């Protein structure tokens, strides 16, 4: 790795690629994020627009487990289950799959995508989106709330 370094290819070039005029000094602009709002303000405003200031109210101790919930959209519910069983449920109209997405690791079912027409499916989840439920019972299925 050290023999591929760019400094090696400037070995006899005096300035080491850092300029004969400006030189390579130590912290000529300041240390870290020093000059924001003063002499690095163009950089801060051009690349990190909303950096300065505060917005919103404080949440004192969070406990992310309380509001943790992974989501899944309806268009992946059928792909959750294996191909052969998908074919079985498609060919047979009197049976429907009952999928407990909470077991796969999803807490909320979201409504993005398209479910197969006239293919009933019962979905068990802790939370449901309004459009997710609308699509599920539009294809003849049902949403079951679990906890």
């Amino acid at each position: 790795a050290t023999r591929f370094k760019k400094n090696r290819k400037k070995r006899g070039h005096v300035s080491a690629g850092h300029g004969r005029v400006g030189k390579h000094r130590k912290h000529p602009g300041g240390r870290g994020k020093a000059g924001g709002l003063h002499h690095m303000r163009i950089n801060f405003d051009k690349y990190h627009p909303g950096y300065f200031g505060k917005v919103g109210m404080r949440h004192l101790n969070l406990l992310k487990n309380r509001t943790y919930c992974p989501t899944i959209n309806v268009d992946k519910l059928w792909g959750l289950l294996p191909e052969e069983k998908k074919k079985e449920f498609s060919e047979n109209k009197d049976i429907a799959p009952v999928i407990d997405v909470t077991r796969k690791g999803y807490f909320k079912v979201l409504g993005n995508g398209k479910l197969k027409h006239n293919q009933p499916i019962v979905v068990k989840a802790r939370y449901f989106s309004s459009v997710a439920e609308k699509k599920i019972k539009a294809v003849g299925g049902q949403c079951i709330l679990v906890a």
Binding site: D45, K46, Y47, H48, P49, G50, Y51, F52, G53, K54, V55, G56, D75, K76, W78, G79, L80, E83, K86, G113, K116
Partner: protein
């Protein structure tokens, strides 16, 4: 002394050689360079050029987009110089003849189960050396997250670039310059 542009030397841009030292891909590049030279086929010229491209210009093409792009002509064969990935959102596949650089295991299994077939580029050169009934396809070369940070700087007016931040809560890059209530907005 002569007053020419760039001192009179034509300058090309982009790749000139394969960078990958994968022996199979080197063999494939040799075969398709020969094919492009010896036939007139723009098909082979394009394939020879695309085999050379970096990874970011050989993006994956999902099964759903593959079978959507090949909907109108069903007896042709689709050639992709990237990888073919599975799409769980797709409910059913149908009888696809696809040549590609690589197939994920799920995509390959699904294609053979649907009854189509997966082809390598040497088989494509064997059976359709000119590209008859062969449709050149590619995945989204600009969908990747790196492009989301490119373009106008985040901070220029009406800019859609994603900024570089550690996290994306309310207290990260969201106060001054991103809402009217703190100086200005974007």
């Amino acid at each position: 002394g002569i007053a020419l542009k760039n001192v009179g030397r034509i300058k090309k841009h982009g790749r000139k050689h394969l960078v990958s030292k994968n022996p199979y891909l080197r063999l494939l590049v040799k075969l398709y360079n020969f094919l492009a030279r010896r036939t007139n086929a723009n098909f082979n010229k394009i394939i020879a050029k695309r085999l050379i491209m970096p990874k970011r210009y050989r993006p994956p093409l999902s099964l759903s987009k593959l079978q959507y792009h090949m909907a109108n002509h069903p007896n042709d064969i689709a050639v992709v110089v990237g990888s073919i990935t599975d799409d769980k959102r797709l409910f059913s596949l149908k009888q696809l003849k696809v040549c590609a650089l690589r197939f994920t295991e799920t995509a390959r299994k699904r294609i053979e189960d649907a009854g189509g077939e997966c082809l390598t580029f040497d088989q494509l050169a064997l059976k359709y050396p000119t590209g008859k009934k062969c449709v050149l396809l590619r995945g989204p070369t600009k969908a990747r997250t790196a492009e989301k940070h490119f373009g106008k700087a985040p901070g220029k007016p009406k800019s859609k670039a994603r900024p570089y931040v550690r996290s994306k809560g309310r207290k990260f890059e969201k106060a001054r310059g991103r809402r009217k209530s703190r100086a200005y907005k974007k």
